[model samples]
Target: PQIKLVLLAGVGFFLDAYDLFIINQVAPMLAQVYFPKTGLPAQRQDLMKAAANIGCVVGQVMFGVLGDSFGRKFVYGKELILIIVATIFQMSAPSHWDGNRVLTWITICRVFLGIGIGGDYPMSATVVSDRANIHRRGTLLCFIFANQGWGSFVGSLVTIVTISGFKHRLKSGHTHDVDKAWRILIGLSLIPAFGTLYQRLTGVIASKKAHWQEFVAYFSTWNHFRNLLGSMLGWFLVEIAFYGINLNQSVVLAQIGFADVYDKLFQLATGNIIVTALGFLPGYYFTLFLIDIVGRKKLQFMGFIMSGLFLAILAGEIDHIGKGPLLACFTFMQFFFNFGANTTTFIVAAELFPTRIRASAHGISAAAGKCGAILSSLVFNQLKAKIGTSAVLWIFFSTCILGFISTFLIDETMGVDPDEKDLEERRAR
Candidate 1:
């Protein structure tokens, strides 16, 4: 029964991963349909990526507060409906209508979609935590988040499959209705969004401990505020590096000869499949199996350090490397990212605060991460030009080190009952 609850919440994350990463696949398709010869200019491209992230911040913060104040189950299904509506409009948006107009429409829809995606993080994390036993608390959250790896993997897998199926006039380029592939690639996420909506509102409903007065009282003090800060700052620090590398994977894919339009589509798609499978997917499972036994804080601390070490190699060897070495180094970087901060940040935020403010706490931290993602997209894209790719990677390496240090701020929360902590915090106060 609980696994059923977890699955409903878990699929929300799957949709989130699928929606977010599929954008990468659809990006080149957009260039072909709308901009054809030139591809998406960096300016619009940044706007496109940042729109989702920006809306994510709004959703995370809003839903965080609402989940606590109104109750988690009450706030659950609204985001899914928003995603469904926005996706239909977004997919139906026509290139023949105008120039950059479709891009604007898509980005606008993406902002709403991002909002839905953002809201899911807190709702899923908090809802699952509510039902999960303390013995498997860390393990359960890992399972919910583990869906992300598969969601991202599906994004890459479907891209290769979808682009391959559309393999007409690949040599000549965009001669046929390649437009359908992007629509279909992205449109599929709607199924899961719809699939989970009913279950979210009814199937896994639970009693709430968070009353707004209690939430406000608990979070107002410096003693309590710091716990929230710990959650926020660690996630804030890690995501800057996480999105920086993932977004820039396209460039590295290009450097490795995955950039030609035909081969570009196939090769880049395949490269995403390779890296995500080799590195990104495995890291989540590593955390899933070991999280409770190894403990959340130590796992996160080690993860940051481990991830940084791999990043440092990429930053240093980017220039000296060939395709085989570059992909090897990049794959390892993806592994450590998921193994450590990427998964842990989400878990830490959910575990750090008390039951009264759990959703809000995770919400704020997730919002902080999005702030980093938004910042990473805005600055990293611009900076990668003046400073160059290796320098950009070096910055990511340094951020991981800083993230390693920041992990100390978060408390070890493996066995701590969130409500028990709330009671203890009240006594301490």
Candidate 2:
């Protein structure tokens, strides 16, 4: 039963991962299709790169509101349906359009896709956290969130496989048919959505009595509002750095003369698999074991601090690492990042709010993150064009530092049993 529940939750998480990471895989194809002109200029490519993230910002904000008012299951299923519609629209871009019109349609679909992705943040995190045993909450949430890494890995693999299989045909510049590959990928997503829908409608259970009481309690007090405010601000900064870097790193690497495309992507995918299976898995499991023993406040605070430190260090080395060393540094960076800040952020988001409002809390924080993501995407590219990649890295380093300081304001939630009634009563106080 526990395994079944985890699988159910994983389906939502998997879709989230697919939506967020799939764009990166699609970017090269998009560039080839939309900006194929000679001397087409870097600015246009940058705009295309940042467009999806801008949509994500809107999606996060809107979906957060939707999840707070509606149930998690509804938002979760609805978001998948939205993703399917958006992806189909996205895949159909070239068939009905060209050039600027195609870009416009793609951007519009991406916004809707992003909104669907944003909904998953709160929905998946809260659902998994709610079902997890208290002692294993951190571990479970981390594993749930870790789906992002696997999703990225799969995206890269799919791109590589498709491109490889069609390399000979593509030599005659038969790249137009590449749209079919994307269509297949988008269509494949429906299967999981149906599977998740089945589980939600028939298999899993929910606590309606506790859910109703807690919902009323959330709006009844100032303390809940305050907590929400703090979380929103903190998440805003984290998302800026997290989404900006993760989503756009390949583009960054490509910019700095690291466009090995296939071989390099293979390396990145392999590294992610290793780290998730070994490093992220243990880091999260250990955090769960220690959540009660060490306290939530300390773990979160320290996680932010360490992540910030690494970002600073990576920023300093941006110019110094050259090619080979840069790859090594990024591998270690990925490992440390998962082991520290990324893991803690998800755990904190899950445990910090009341059960009824938990999904709302996550939505708000995720929205903030997506907002930051938008800024990062725009700012990073613009900054890189104006100043350099080094400056952009420094900006991210500073954002991570801000996230560390924000951690000081949250209440320690260690060893607190899950309590819908206590949350309601506390709000009344």
Query: Which candidate number maximizes TM-score?
Result: 1
Alpha-carbon RMSD to native, per candidate: 4.1, 5.7
Alpha carbon lDDT of residue 20, candidate 2? 62
Assess each prediction's global lDDT (C-alpha) against the native.
Answer: 0.74, 0.60
Candidate 1 per-residue C-alpha lDDT over 1-429 given as tens digits, one digit per residue, 9 for 90 to 100: 546767876777788777776776777777767787665666666666766677677777666567656876666678788777777777788756764788888878888887777677666776667766557788888887888787878877888888888776566655546678888878878777666765665522233343556777877988777778777877887788877666555556666645645666787888888888888888888889888888876776777776777677777876776778778767777777778888888888887776656755676688788888788865766776678877877777777777877777667877778687667756998
Residue 205, model 2: Cα distance from true site in angstroms: 29
For candidate 2, the lDDT comes to 0.60
- The sequence of per-residue lDDT tens digits that candidate 2 reaches over residues 176-290 is 6666665555555556656665666661125645755766677466766655665665667666666666666565555433543234444433444343444434445555466
Model 1 residue 263 distance off true place after TM-score fit, in angstroms: 2.2
| Backbone atom clashes (below 3 Å) for every candidate | 0, 2
Minimal lDDT window, size 10, model 1: 203-212
Clashes of 1: 0
Model 2 weakest lDDT span, ten residues long: 260-269
What residue pairs are clashing in model 2?
Answer: 59-115, 240-372
C-alpha TM-score for every candidate: 0.88, 0.77
